[PDB]
């Protein structure tokens with residue numbers, strides 16, 4: 001491509017939103033804010049601890065911005081979990097996001113990974129040291145099966161970040177590479193399994209549905225991002241190994257053909273997602289529907305994805321899509337547009353400096 | 355039908371061995387046997403230890419049969435790894451095969467999985483106790499990156515077996531379930547990464563190729579089995595939740611449509627497998643080609659897959675398939691057909707009983 005497929009983007013987006021049934025919720029801005037600040041505050045105090053401040057090498061400003069981007073995603077998507085749950089999930093997912101930062105080679109620190117694990121000795125890699133130490137606060141909200149899923153997916157993620165360091169889009173013809181990588185660093189099963197706290201659900205009772213949820217949520221969650229994230233990533237010459245971009249390199253297809261591959265999967269996933277869970281345990285479909293809608297809300301609201309920019313362009317345009325989009329956007333805006341000043345405070349740096 | 359597409363089976367298989375370039379090797383029967391007995395002997399002595407004999411609850415006969423099925427698969431596929439390597443890999447993969455047996459619910463034993471792991475306390479589940487204890491002998495043949503892969507994939511496998519106990523083929527319409535499950539219990543990355551001992555390869559030097567190998571081998575390895583295993587697996591009352599069978603249940607398609615899907619993926623995988631690695635480091639393509647051919651050899655040779663039965667019903671036909679099928683089957687049973695009496699002895703029970 002040359003310029004952004006604005007309209008095509010609009011169409012697909014609108015379609016995605018319809019398929020999932022993007023409608024208003026009883027999750028008020030007062031509530032969103034209540035939770036945002038709760039989660040943010042617990043996390044902030046956590047990342048402000050000296051030990052964390054030391055072992056986690058991250059630019060203060062990025063830790064701040066990342067923590068905020070995470071708390072938002074969690075609060076807006078795990079709408080049904082408890083406040084403490086959102087908090088602890090926020091701390092975990094902030095750790096994972098921060099790891100994408102380290103340029104440092106894992107090799108030397110991963111050499112005795114298994115021996116130290118089995119021995120109970122703190123890991124050599126500082127990230128694992130902090131993360132595995134904190135993990136119990138996340139795992140306490142879940143049952144054994146879901147916990148196993150969170151554990152695995154996180155391990156998966158670590159490897160993903162490692163592979164990512166090589167900035168490799170796959171050898172041309174290596175068709176299986178792209179999705180292999182996307183799943184590797186997508187945290188699919190972590191997200192999927194983290195949607196079912198043992199306080200509101202029963203793994204054994206809903207094993208089949210939970211397992212199915214994980215299986216399906218994994219792809220929906222990553223593809224919806226790759227999709228809605230396509231606008232911010234379009235011109236970012238720094239971001240060179242994204243799913244779509246790798247489809248191009250590995251499958252040797254046009255950036256458009258690749259974008260098409262994505263949209264198709266995204267939609268199909270959405271459809272089947274609804275098809276499967278609609279007539280299932282109401283409490284399930286609920287958590288599932290809330291996550292999907294919240295996930296889309298957050299994407300549309302976080303400046304990280306600069307979607308507000310495509311809002312202006314098609315704002316006054318009088319076509320169908322352009323309008324259906326703006327309506328949806330405006331929808332989310334009313335519940336999701338919240339000035340950080342209302343919840344994200346004080347800054348992590350400040351709590352730390354004390 | 356409740357019959358068996360014997361024709362498509364033969365055709366697909368040929369196309370398969372053709373794509374992979376199924377040709378003779380310099381891996382003589384004397385050599386195969388030398389390795390078979392080496393691996394078997396080390397493993398046998400291992401599984402005959404009192405601790406192992408206790409914690410691993412398996413019917414002696416099955417442990418015996420399984421151990422033999424594993425040693426064979428390894429020796430015939432990891433043709434380039436050292437003898438000790440094949441041995442240790444045999445011990446690990448025998449553990450994984452045996453786990454498919456336990457009908458026991460993992461839940462209660464997995465409740466403190468993470469806390470015991472981080473603390474260095476032996477796992478509650480006896481399998482993990484034995485497997486994690488032994489793991490170092492497997493991991494010593496690899497570098498940190500490949501080790502991580504073996505570790506993850508094995509964890510993945512454990513979950514797979516858990517999900518398997520529910521004998522669930524997926525909710526109709528849950529299109530992403532099948533492959534999710536297949537990969538979960540396929541040991542894809544374990545196999546893929548175990549092909550590169552640090553004694554013959556350099557993870558850092560061949561990171562890109564090794565990573566790509568894992569990414570591609572994962573699907574080829576599982577699909578080729580699902581394919582060649584489509585025999586002994588169908589006329590069953592046990593593992594009724596196979597990949598193909600689940601495609602049917604989840605994608606709501608005919609057993610034939612499902613079978614064609616597999617064969618399409620299997621071939622394509624094969625095609626690209628060759629396309630990608632041919633012009634790559636010769637030593638790589640070599641390990642890769644040997645694994646593929648050996649993997650097919652072993653399937654054709656192990657009783658477990660009863661492929662000898664389709665040999666007879668075609669050992670005398672005209673089609674360029676039933677004939678071009680035995681042309682290989684023959685070769686297979688030439689360097690691969692080996693009476694257990696020549697290597698698998700004494701029996702594990704015997705060493706144990708002493």
Ligand SMILES: CC(C)=CCC[N@H+](C)[C@H]1CC=C(C)CC1
Nearest residue numbers: 070073093096097186187222225
């Ligand atoms: C970057 C964010 C928050 C979301 C985009 C989705 N990603 C596929 C994953 C990236 C790492 C995390 C923490 C969660 C999910």
Ligand SMILES: CC(C)=CCC[N@H+](C)[C@H]1CC=C(C)CC1
Nearest residue numbers: 424427447450451539540541579
């Ligand atoms: C089952 C066997 C031995 C070979 C075919 C491939 N499997 C599907 C894999 C999963 C289970 C193991 C133990 C090994 C590899």
Ligand SMILES: [Mg+2]
Nearest residue numbers: 225226229230
């Ligand atoms: Mg993206």
Ligand SMILES: [Mg+2]
Nearest residue numbers: 100229239242
């Ligand atoms: Mg990114």
Ligand SMILES: [Mg+2]
Nearest residue numbers: 579580583587
């Ligand atoms: Mg099979």
Ligand SMILES: [Mg+2]
Nearest residue numbers: 454539593596
């Ligand atoms: Mg099986």
